[PDB]
Amino acid sequence: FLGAAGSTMGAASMTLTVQARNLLSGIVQQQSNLLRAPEAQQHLLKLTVWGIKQLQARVLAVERYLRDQQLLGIWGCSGKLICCTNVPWNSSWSNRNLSEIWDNMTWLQWDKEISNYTQIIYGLLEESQNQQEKNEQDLLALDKWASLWNWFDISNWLWYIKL
Amino acid sequence: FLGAAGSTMGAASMTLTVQARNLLSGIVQQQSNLLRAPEAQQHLLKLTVWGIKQLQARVLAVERYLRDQQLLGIWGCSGKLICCTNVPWNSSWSNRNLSEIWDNMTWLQWDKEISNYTQIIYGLLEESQNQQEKNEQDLLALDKWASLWNWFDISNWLWYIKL
Amino acid sequence: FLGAAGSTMGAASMTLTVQARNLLSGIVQQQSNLLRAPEAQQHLLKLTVWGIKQLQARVLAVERYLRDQQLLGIWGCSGKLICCTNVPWNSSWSNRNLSEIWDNMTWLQWDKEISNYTQIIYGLLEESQNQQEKNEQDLLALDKWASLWNWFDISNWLWYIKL
Amino acid sequence: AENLWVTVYYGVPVWKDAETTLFCASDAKTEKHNVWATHACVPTDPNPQEIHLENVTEEFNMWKNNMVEQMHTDIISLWDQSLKPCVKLTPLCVTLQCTNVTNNITDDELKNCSFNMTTELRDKKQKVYSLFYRLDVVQIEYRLINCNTSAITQACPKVSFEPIPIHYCAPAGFAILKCKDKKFNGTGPCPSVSTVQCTHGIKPVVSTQLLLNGSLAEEEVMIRSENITNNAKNILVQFNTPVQINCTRPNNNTRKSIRIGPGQAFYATGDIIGDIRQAHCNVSKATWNETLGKVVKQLRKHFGNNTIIRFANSSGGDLEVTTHSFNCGGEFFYCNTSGLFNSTWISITLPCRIKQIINMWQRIGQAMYAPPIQGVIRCVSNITGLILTRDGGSTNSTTETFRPGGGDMRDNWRSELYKYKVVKIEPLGVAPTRCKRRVV
Amino acid sequence: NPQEIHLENVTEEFNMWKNNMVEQMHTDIISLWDQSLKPCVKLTPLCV
Amino acid sequence: IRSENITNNAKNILVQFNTPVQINCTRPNNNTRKSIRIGPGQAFYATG
Ligand SMILES: *[C@@H]1O[C@H](CO)[C@@H](O[C@@H]2O[C@H](CO)[C@@H](O[C@@H]3O[C@H](CO)[C@@H](O)[C@H](O)[C@@H]3O)[C@H](O)[C@H]2NC(C)=O)[C@H](O)[C@H]1NC(C)=O
Ligand SMILES: *[C@@H]1O[C@H](CO)[C@@H](O[C@@H]2O[C@H](CO)[C@@H](O[C@@H]3O[C@H](CO)[C@@H](O)[C@H](O)[C@@H]3O)[C@H](O)[C@H]2NC(C)=O)[C@H](O)[C@H]1NC(C)=O
Ligand SMILES: *[C@@H]1O[C@H](CO)[C@@H](O[C@@H]2O[C@H](CO)[C@@H](O)[C@H](O)[C@H]2NC(C)=O)[C@H](O)[C@H]1NC(C)=O
Ligand SMILES: *[C@@H]1O[C@H](CO)[C@@H](O)[C@H](O)[C@H]1NC(C)=O
Ligand SMILES: *[C@@H]1O[C@H](CO)[C@@H](O)[C@H](O)[C@H]1NC(C)=O
Ligand SMILES: *[C@@H]1O[C@H](CO)[C@@H](O)[C@H](O)[C@H]1NC(C)=O
Ligand SMILES: *[C@@H]1O[C@H](CO)[C@@H](O)[C@H](O)[C@H]1NC(C)=O
Ligand SMILES: *[C@@H]1O[C@H](CO)[C@@H](O)[C@H](O)[C@H]1NC(C)=O
Ligand SMILES: *[C@@H]1O[C@H](CO)[C@@H](O)[C@H](O)[C@H]1NC(C)=O
Ligand SMILES: *[C@@H]1O[C@H](CO)[C@@H](O)[C@H](O)[C@H]1NC(C)=O
Ligand SMILES: *[C@@H]1O[C@H](CO)[C@@H](O)[C@H](O)[C@H]1NC(C)=O
Ligand SMILES: *[C@@H]1O[C@H](CO)[C@@H](O)[C@H](O)[C@H]1NC(C)=O
Ligand SMILES: *[C@@H]1O[C@H](CO)[C@@H](O)[C@H](O)[C@H]1NC(C)=O
Ligand SMILES: *[C@@H]1O[C@H](CO)[C@@H](O)[C@H](O)[C@H]1NC(C)=O
Ligand SMILES: *[C@@H]1O[C@H](CO)[C@@H](O)[C@H](O)[C@H]1NC(C)=O
Ligand SMILES: *[C@@H]1O[C@H](CO)[C@@H](O)[C@H](O)[C@H]1NC(C)=O
Ligand SMILES: *[C@@H]1O[C@H](CO)[C@@H](O)[C@H](O)[C@H]1NC(C)=O
Ligand SMILES: *[C@@H]1O[C@H](CO)[C@@H](O)[C@H](O)[C@H]1NC(C)=O
Ligand SMILES: *[C@@H]1O[C@H](CO)[C@@H](O)[C@H](O)[C@H]1NC(C)=O
Ligand SMILES: *[C@@H]1O[C@H](CO)[C@@H](O)[C@H](O)[C@H]1NC(C)=O
Ligand SMILES: *[C@@H]1O[C@H](CO)[C@@H](O)[C@H](O)[C@H]1NC(C)=O
Ligand SMILES: *[C@@H]1O[C@H](CO)[C@@H](O)[C@H](O)[C@H]1NC(C)=O
Ligand SMILES: *[C@@H]1O[C@H](CO)[C@@H](O)[C@H](O)[C@H]1NC(C)=O
Ligand SMILES: *[C@@H]1O[C@H](CO)[C@@H](O)[C@H](O)[C@H]1NC(C)=O
């Protein structure tokens, strides 16, 4: 857990050759202590201090661990820890070297690199995930899969596989 | 958010050419005010009025925003905002025009159209999603002469696309 | 709900020819009574006994109904009620008959069979799901300046776009 | 090169500094009637998985920390929660006709008070012996000292005040860092951090002017402050040597139960066995001379090596600021620590006075009444550090004076939550790569 | 409405002297007693 | 003019303005306060 967070992303390519260095299972499975005993107590005590504080911490962790699942759902990446997108690296102005990034830069320094435009990227991603990709998929079924291919106007299929 | 809810579904084809007009992100991300401060308070006050009311509102929003994810899971549509099904438009008796629906009718009037049979559709969908589709997929790891060549059903299999 | 839990897995092949005999919808939709009225009460009463007990039961059900979704996410099975894995039946020592298991054995007796090694299987599954399968997928789209240039793979693409 | 494409990554180990609620973790061991564990808040405390990170210099802070304010409001809320269902003593604020005692030595003292009470069936009152100290009766003959301030609810005698250690465990989606650098003074980048699920055993003691039973640092007696330049900034100091405090209270203290109305007893100190000596605390002068040698020989690194004097704490305040106040098994001491501070530049007794009516140990208002304890009270444990304040003034060059002031309760918990910090986890990260999706 | 479903085929072991619902019912009843009794009239002036 | 229905006579007729008419209210006396001690630390403020 977090075991190579200080490493560079090339030595934290090591982190995502393992389970993102166990980050997600440490997110949901560090609940196991307050999961093991909110109920082993058989005591009256007539009032509860943790009855609001532990509950607020618990549902805070749950909503935080669902917003990210919904955001991976909204970019077609649901289930997949590492997925790629149709959004290009745009005019976004931290254009730099590949062998600088994935060899000599930590994840935290990388967060300091692109601390701006992060909401720009998050707004940008679903655009290519949905507004044309879902509409192309909606086009792709309102034509018989094996009946159009005689016209010699087959590019539409080619167009949907290159652009 | 909700910005074209009064438009017709043709002008709310505009809504689902964008992120269903931002409906889902407004579902989960309008939590951010009670996410930003259930904890910025450092005050005793010895009792809490919101300690039940805010918590009940919060877990109400969470269970409502999980029942729909589970219902999209049960129809094989998990992740996908717009997906298609094998259930046909059945004997369901609001059979009408395509250029009437997706050109001149709002989403709310459409809800007033098919307010009945909605639980019929919801029961109907998982049937074609599971009871034969999952069983065909369970078949699809082993078969006899038929899988490569059954020469009977295939014409009807082509015929389903045909009619 | 639970309607053939006592049947053998061959007569509970009947259960998973229906919605695992309605188990998952009974998991999340038996909340509907405490979903229908934690709020229909308009009474002061100045204190609450259920304000901790019902809330603890509710978030207990929610975290239990999310750990399993995350565990299906970690084995690439997210969405799919029945999915297969690349992990073989290993040296695991309850090697026995196919026509004994899926004809004459209940689910509960089956749980009594493999009550051991269940955490071994759970640790074993993600290994073949990730440590080579995700790394093979990472090998797929990195090096192919010649991915646009494919000449003898069109046949699978054409087959695949129809079926 | 070619145009790269963005690739999301879910589970990137980055963190931001945040603030949230934590919770207990203790252990089970019946008679869990403790005021600070709220009868085993979380009785689990599992095995302490600690993970190093090897490669990150994270910045820390102890004077801007958030866990000390959470610990302070937790302790005052647990105090007022445990004190709530006990016996009120508003029928006690009456006129007392008192007189001295004479069985043993002078210079102790006690007042033999008697009042009209024992009111049981709302019609019958009785003349009742009682035996109060000074420092909680005043003249007019006598009344209690808190009757012009608020009511005087006594403690339930079944609960105890032993500080069993608690462990603050972070919620899910957060992490607790932990600096392992053995010379991290107060604030700044710690080069070698680590991650724990929860902290070590924190004994939540309450002691002014010499913090007790603490977690002692290494052989460099560290000096922590906010800045040395400001004269009104408390200079914590942390030891490496556990100097012992043999404290005691010599009398025998028979208890005597008084019935008040319906079923509410009241415990007043009866006639003692008859050996009135003074409550005191011994510290061996050799080890104290050495630990003062170490504190003064690592205080000359912060300014010029000249003329350190220490003094008694100019008083005023009350007993909370002038004397070393602590409780020793449910009896609240106040010990005149003048006799430990002379000029270090080149066995010890301590008279202790005992109050019984304690104020709210920070606030003004509600005030508890500690019932007496039978037998002879004797408890020993270690000191771990002082709390000093500089004086300064016109002393531009020499005769630097330090006097062990320090009155707040937060600084005790800043003396053990300095090597901890809470961080949130932002698992979602993007990065440009050479992969682009198969668009059907 | 009380939906009850048989299982037809399972011999499950039961216990009544190790049951947990009786302790929940007992602490529920004593807590409801002391909760309902709380805002009523004291009678400490009656002990005369 | 808002109501539930004008036909029922026992239905409150709200009315809403467009002009803020001012109300200059006052109380002319000076009202010294006087604190009274009651028992332990509970003051009581009576008009002196
Ligand atoms: C108060 O005393 C300290 C003593 O450390 C003075 O600080 C300076 O400290 C360094 C070490 O951190 C001294 O260097 C040492 O010198 C000795 C020879 O005397 C050598 O054997 C060691 O290996 C090391 O190099 C340095 O001499 C010392 N400076 C002095 C004594 O002037 C501090 O300066 C003193 N306070 C004042 C106001 O001078
Ligand atoms: C200073 O450290 C000690 C270390 O334990 C803290 O605990 C106190 O230790 C003494 C023993 O040295 C306990 O006294 C006696 O313990 C025996 C054990 O058999 C018991 O039979 C007696 O009834 C008596 O308790 C003492 O109870 C124990 N706890 C307290 C609250 O004094 C001590 O708390 C530390 N000092 C402070 C101020 O916290
Ligand atoms: C304790 O160590 C810290 C480590 O950073 C020192 O902090 C800073 O040190 C630099 C360089 O010496 C100074 O420029 C800063 O002004 C220091 N900051 C603070 C807040 O002091 C610090 O000097 C050391 N000493 C003390 C007493 O904190
Ligand atoms: C820390 O960085 C060094 C690079 O000098 C590297 O050799 C080492 O493996 C890194 N440690 C971890 C835990 O990644
Ligand atoms: C990328 O960065 C490395 C230094 O990290 C440098 O050696 C290399 O030449 C760079 N490549 C390009 C194409 O700039
Ligand atoms: C490469 O990394 C080392 C340590 O990680 C660092 O000292 C060096 O400056 C880095 N060089 C570049 C070009 O990033
Ligand atoms: C990133 O955003 C911050 C806003 O806090 C701004 O101050 C900074 O200039 C931006 N640009 C960077 C770090 O290049
Ligand atoms: C409302 O409907 C009219 C159709 O007459 C259309 O022109 C207009 O764009 C609609 N407004 C919105 C916000 O969709
Ligand atoms: C569909 O409805 C439109 C009116 O919205 C009408 O003009 C058109 O003729 C209809 N088409 C059919 C096939 O009925
Ligand atoms: C088409 O829409 C307009 C306004 O949206 C409405 O006035 C008209 O009646 C509609 N016509 C049909 C046939 O739905
Ligand atoms: C739809 O269901 C409602 C039940 O509330 C019923 O009254 C109505 O007749 C149904 N049919 C419609 C609106 O065509
Ligand atoms: C119970 O088992 C018998 C096998 O003897 C089978 O015939 C019957 O259908 C089973 N009942 C259910 C509900 O599955
Ligand atoms: C499998 O088990 C059945 C009994 O349930 C038996 O009749 C059959 O012969 C077995 N098959 C093998 C290959 O052992
Ligand atoms: C087959 O099932 C029946 C009832 O379910 C049982 O009596 C019989 O022993 C079983 N036989 C085997 C070989 O499992
Ligand atoms: C399964 O694990 C249990 C541990 O409770 C053990 O007692 C048993 O021997 C194991 N093996 C079986 C049931 O074959
Ligand atoms: C009681 O002690 C005080 C202490 O100064 C003294 O003034 C007073 O005279 C004493 N009274 C008796 C009766 O001893
Ligand atoms: C109690 O009341 C009696 C009534 O005369 C009085 O004499 C006595 O002095 C009172 N008690 C005290 C302590 O003054
Ligand atoms: C403190 O020292 C004195 C001096 O002899 C001794 O009489 C007394 O017993 C000591 N007290 C303790 C608690 O050790
Ligand atoms: C206090 O005075 C009463 C009066 O009779 C006496 O009996 C009692 O012993 C006195 N207490 C002491 C400690 O002398
Ligand atoms: C402690 O006792 C000495 C004895 O002379 C006294 O002078 C001093 O004032 C006392 N300490 C304080 C803080 O008053
Ligand atoms: C300092 O030493 C002198 C030596 O006579 C002694 O009288 C005095 O009490 C001591 N003061 C303190 C505060 O230790
Ligand atoms: C305290 O009083 C008890 C009661 O008789 C006695 O047995 C004991 O010796 C006394 N002294 C102590 C504990 O020093
Ligand atoms: C006091 O110091 C000793 C010596 O290191 C240590 O063993 C003990 O645990 C400390 N704490 C106590 C007695 O509470
Ligand atoms: C109200 O009017 C009277 C009439 O002159 C005047 O004396 C009085 O001061 C007024 N009060 C206020 C509050 O304006």
Numbering used by the authors:
A (entry chain D), B (entry chain B), C (entry chain F): 522 to 684
D (entry chain C): 31 to 59, 63 to 141, 145 to 176, 190 to 395, 411 to 504
E (entry chain E): 80 to 127
F (entry chain A): 272 to 319
From the study:
The trimeric gp160 HIV-1 envelope spike protein (Env), a transmembrane glycoprotein comprising three protomers each of gp120 and gp41, is the singular virus-derived protein on the virion. Hence, it is the sole target of protective antibodies arising naturally in patients or elicitable in uninfected individuals through vaccination. Vaccines targeting HIV-1’s gp160 spike protein are stymied by high viral mutation rates and structural chicanery. gp160’s membrane-proximal external region (MPER) is the target of naturally arising broadly neutralizing antibodies (bnAbs), yet MPER-based vaccines fail to generate bnAbs. Here, nanodisc-embedded spike protein was investigated by cryo-electron microscopy and molecular-dynamics simulations, revealing spontaneous ectodomain tilting that creates vulnerability for HIV-1.
Projection averages obtained by 2D classification of negatively stained particles revealed that one to three Fabs could be bound to a gp145. Finally, in the gp145•3Fab map, all three Fabs are bound to gp145 in binding mode 2. The 3.7-Å resolution of the gp145•3Fab map enabled us to build an atomic model for the ectodomain as well as the entire MPER for one of the subunits and backbone models for the MPERs of the other two subunits, thus revealing how the MPER is connected to the former. Antibody binding also interferes with Env function by exerting tension on the transmembrane domains.
